[PDB]
Design a protein around this nucleic acid. Structure first.
Ligand SMILES: [Mg+2]
Ligand SMILES: [Mg+2]
Ligand SMILES: [Mg+2]
Lengths: 549, 390
DNA sequence: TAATTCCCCCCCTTCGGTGCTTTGCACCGAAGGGGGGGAA
């Protein structure tokens, strides 16, 4: 029946009461699925019958289980969840098959009726009351209260997870050679014992679980490979994702694109080279959830490439603690990176991608460093150690960047791999003024009220220009003024500015930015073979800045 | 048992736990298992909504792991003197009195806030949650309770060498006695069985101007900007009589001025620059802010102040050349050194403005931390104001 | 017309905090919205 495990004390927030939401009418099919379920659990003491002494109520309904023949009973505990005290979640992440070591024998078990086998605090049970809406004589409906953990309650997952750990602890304290992966009520049991001894000790585990009230039905007891575990197919020496089906639609709505992108981020954990940026670019604009977006040519090629990749079968491999993890990174382009973590060449532990664009202004080196950080954190999560990187950036370029950059940057041990395209910096700022080149004193200022401004430059050789900017800003006026100097000068320029904002934007060597003005500035800087940028304060009457301003 | 209450109107810490490495997880499991064995901690369930991060560190010449719990949010909401001449000594020494708190039980009503979660590799098991039963480490309330016996347990050694001005902060004792190096080790060795740095060479870095003869237009511009920026810090900088010299649309490399009144003005500014800025008094009520800048080849510059441009202390930390490519290690060592200096001088841990991205610091700072306490920090983004503090 | 919960990942959008450009831009980090994945 139910477990003899102790009940976790649960209380409500101070000055609150239980829900009193009247049950909504249910369709004829779902009442017969509920009276059956309630009759079955009422005999076992899982739910008890109550009378007029309990005023609280909560709606109930039912969905179809993954078996597609049995019904799952749920209670809409949203109000009670609002008035229920807070819990700390003990589930910290999803186990990954790449973190699994090769085991001689493996068995996957599922506890039958996991929540219904764990008792619930007595002084809380009255808040879990509900009514079954028989649709015969409209009334009377029969009223029950839960005696076990109900599905739909916010505290049920945390309570169950911490209760199942206490049940598995006595078994694990005396079987250190057995590895038990516990997710909810799903158990993956691995051992190096032979098949006979493994099965014999598995039967000991199933007896230990049954002694604690948790049954393990034989229909959910897996004994032969491939094992369907946590969305993966586990063979003796490899693992794959369960088959992923992509929609084949001639007209894509916002939701369909959203579904397709989600199914590609999931497929990218083992398939290499999955690109989704073009597909996700159609989701910009808050276009409802039914609006039909035609596929652009740039977003069609990415879809064709992603469909080609998924045609071939791709397998993973298991972890080997003795060897070392090697992570290799490639630049796809437009701020997209792919990475493969493996131990042997062409045998990937896991593949992934990184396409985040942090900050308005950034270059290749910062994105590579962020990708390295993400891979390091993920590897620490999975394998508990930092891998060794094969980066496409040269040691000279990284040395120059980290010596010249004003912020503390560091990446773990890595080696250079000659994989085109290579990460590089497209221009550098001179540390000293250029002798023989024209010196430009540039300045811009925009009115605060009507948002009209003037930006211009003056040269030491007798060449000044002003262009009035409409619908502008004080800082963007400075950016335009700097851009003006680059446009009408030679291959070598000395440039003197006045704004700290332009200094901070420029001297970080950005390559791409969210604004077109900075992109044009970067292009002009790229075609300039020597540039110097110096800052002078404002309103000090400094020589040179007066003529432009 | 001292009843401890939170700040009026505050709640408990609810911080998540960052991922840890395999060695750290194993060490944490062993340590928590033993402290549960003699009842320093107790297992708890999810009905406790409070949580603080935890990890493990290796201290100097110990090779054994030590548990470090991040009681930073709990300290800010707990709501419970400095040695006047601790810096007057020359050989202050740090002692780790951290296991003495495990003998005073924590009050029952407060234990729920001292909860932490140990994760697992590859998430093979839900994280195991524990709560403290005795006075923890890293909590700003443990010294406040242990003091009533901490005084009685040092009273003997306090009348033996009357030259010992001591301090107890967080989990460490700063002992300062103005004596020779030979006597101090014997004095320290006496102290440890009784229970069983360099605070006089810290010099500020004055603001300086470049020295040369050929002052180019760019050089004059940089010097004028430096003087204008420093005028806020040092009242008296006029820079007017030099700004009146740079007149015209001259090129960026012409050395025009050489010998005029500009030399006298530069000398006048140089003379007033070598002063210890009168004022800048330490108010024992405002928060201490320490800002750190990276100046190239393994050099960092730190400024500790309460309000801007009024620097309580300025300094440079070099440690070693750029041989350590590990910028995070150098930054961590600098942070620890600055924190130790602040506790020695002012007795209050500052608030740091680290010049590093959040992800890099949060990923790598645990690998090199070696101190029992943790300072509060934020992350800046000040592209070069063009030297200035060098 | 079905309606719930809890975790992990992704992308996009709003909005508040902070600092300098200073009372208004520029930027960044949390929270929410959708979508995948896992379980009850
Ligand atoms: Mg089950
Ligand atoms: Mg299950
Ligand atoms: Mg299942």
């Amino acid at each position: 029946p139910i477990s003899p495990i102790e009940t976790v004390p649960v209380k409500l927030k101070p000055g609150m009461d239980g829900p009193k939401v009247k049950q909504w009418p249910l369709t004829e099919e779902k009442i017969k699925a509920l009276v059956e379920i309630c009759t079955e659990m009422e005999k076992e003491g899982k739910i008890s019958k109550i009378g007029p002494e309990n005023p609280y109520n909560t709606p109930v309904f039912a969905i179809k289980k993954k078996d597609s023949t049995k019904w799952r009973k749920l209670v809409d505990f949203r109000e009670l969840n609002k008035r229920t005290q807070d819990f700390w979640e003990v589930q910290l992440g999803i186990p990954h098959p790449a973190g699994l070591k090769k085991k001689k024998s493996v068995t996957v078990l599922d506890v039958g009726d996991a929540y219904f086998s764990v008792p619930l605090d007595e002084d809380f049970r009255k808040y879990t009351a509900f009514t079954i809406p028989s649709i015969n004589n409209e009334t009377p409906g029969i009223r029950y209260q839960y005696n076990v953990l109900p599905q739909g309650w916010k505290g049920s997952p945390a309570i169950f997870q911490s209760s199942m750990t206490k049940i598995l602890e006595p078994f694990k304290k005396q079987n250190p050679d057995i590895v038990i992966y516990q997710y909810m009520d799903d158990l993956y049991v691995g051992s190096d014992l032979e098949i006979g001894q493994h099965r014999t000790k598995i039967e000991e585990l199933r007896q230990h679980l049954l002694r604690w009230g948790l049954t393990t039905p034989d229909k959910k007891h897996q004994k032969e490979p491939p094992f369907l575990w946590m969305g993966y197919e586990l063979h003796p020496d490899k693992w794959t994702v369960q088959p992923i089906v992509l929609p084949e639609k001639d007209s894509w709505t916002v939701n369909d694109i959203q579904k397709l992108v989600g199914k590609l981020n999931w497929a990218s954990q083992i398939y290499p080279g999955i690109k989704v940026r073009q597909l996700s670019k159609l989701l910009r604009g808050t276009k409802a959830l039914t609006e039909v977006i035609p596929l652009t040519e740039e977003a069609e090629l990415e879809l064709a490439e992603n469909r080609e990749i998924l045609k071939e079968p791709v397998h993973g491999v298991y972890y080997d603690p003795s060897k070392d993890l090697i992570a290799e990174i490639q630049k796809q382009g437009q701020g997209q990176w792919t990475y493969q973590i493996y131990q042997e060449p062409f045998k990937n532990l896991k593949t992934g991608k990184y396409a985040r664009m942090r900050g308005a202004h950034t270059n290749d080196v910062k994105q590579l460093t962020e990708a390295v950080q993400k891979i390091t954190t993920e590897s620490i999560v999975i394998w508990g150690k930092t891998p060794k990187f094969k980066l496409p950036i040269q040691k000279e370029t990284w040395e120059t960047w980290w010596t010249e950059y004003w912020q503390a940057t560091w990446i773990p041990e890595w080696e250079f791999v000659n994989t085109p395209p290579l990460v590089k910096l497209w221009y550098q700022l001179e540390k000293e003024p250029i002798v023989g080149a024209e010196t430009f004193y540039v300045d811009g200022a925009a009115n605060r009220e009507t948002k009209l401004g003037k930006a211009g430059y003056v040269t030491n050789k007798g060449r000044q220009k002003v262009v009035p900017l409409t619908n502008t800003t004080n800082q963007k006026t400075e950016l335009q003024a700097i851009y003006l100097a680059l446009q009408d000068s030679g291959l070598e320029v000395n440039i003197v500015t006045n704004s700290q904002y332009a200094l901070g934007i420029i001297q970080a060597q950005p390559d791409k930015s969210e604004s077109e003005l900075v992109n044009q500035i970067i292009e002009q800087l790229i075609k300039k073979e020597k540039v110097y940028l110096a800052w002078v304060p404002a309103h000090k009457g400094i020589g040179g800045n007066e003529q432009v301003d | 048992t001292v009843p401890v209450k939170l700040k009026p109107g505050m709640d408990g810490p609810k911080v998540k736990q960052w991922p840890l490495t395999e060695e750290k997880i194993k060490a944490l499991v062993e340590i928590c298992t033993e402290m549960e064995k003699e009842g320093k901690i107790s297992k708890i369930g999810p009905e406790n909504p409070y949580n603080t991060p935890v990890f493990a560190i290796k201290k100097k010449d110990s090779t054994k792991w030590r548990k470090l719990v991040d009681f930073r949010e709990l300290n800010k909401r707990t709501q419970d003197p400095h040695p006047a001449g601790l810096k007057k000594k020359k050989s202050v020494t740090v002692l780790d009195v951290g296991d003495a708190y495990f003998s005073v039980p924590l009050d029952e009503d407060f234990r729920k806030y001292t909860a932490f979660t140990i994760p697992s590799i590859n998430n093979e098991t839900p994280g195991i949650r524990y709560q403290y039963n005795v006075l923890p480490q890293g909590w700003k309330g443990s010294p406040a309770i242990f003091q009533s016996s901490m005084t009685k347990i040092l009273e003997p050694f306090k009348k033996q060498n009357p030259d010992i001005v001591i301090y107890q902060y967080m989990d460490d004792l700063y002992v300062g006695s103005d004596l020779e190096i030979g006597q101090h080790r014997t004095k320290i060795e006496e102290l440890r069985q009784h229970l069983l740095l360099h605070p006089d060479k810290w010099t500020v870095q004055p603001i300086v101007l470049p020295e040369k003869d050929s002052w180019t237009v760019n050089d004059i511009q940089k010097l004028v900007g430096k003087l204008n920026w420093a005028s806020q810090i040092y009242p008296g900088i006029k820079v007017r009589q030099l700004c009146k010299l740079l007149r015209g649309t001259k090129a960026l490399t012409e050395v025009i001025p050489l010998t005029e009144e500009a030399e006298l003005e530069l000398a006048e500014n140089r003379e007033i620059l070598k002063e210890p800025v009168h004022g800048v008094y330490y108010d024992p009520s405002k928060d201490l802010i320490a800002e750190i800048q990276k100046q190239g080849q393994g050099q960092w510059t730190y400024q500790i102040y309460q309000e801007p441009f009024k620097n309580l202390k300025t300094g440079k930390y070099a440690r070693m050349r750029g041989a350590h490519t590990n910028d995070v290690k150098q930054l961590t060592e600098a942070v620890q050194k600055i924190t130790t200096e602040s506790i020695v001088i002012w007795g209050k841990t500052p608030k740091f403005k680290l010049p590093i991205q959040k992800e890099t610091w949060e990923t790598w700072w645990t690998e090199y931390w070696q101190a029992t306490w943790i300072p509060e920090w934020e992350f800046v983004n000040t592209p070069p104001l063009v030297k200035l503090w060098y």
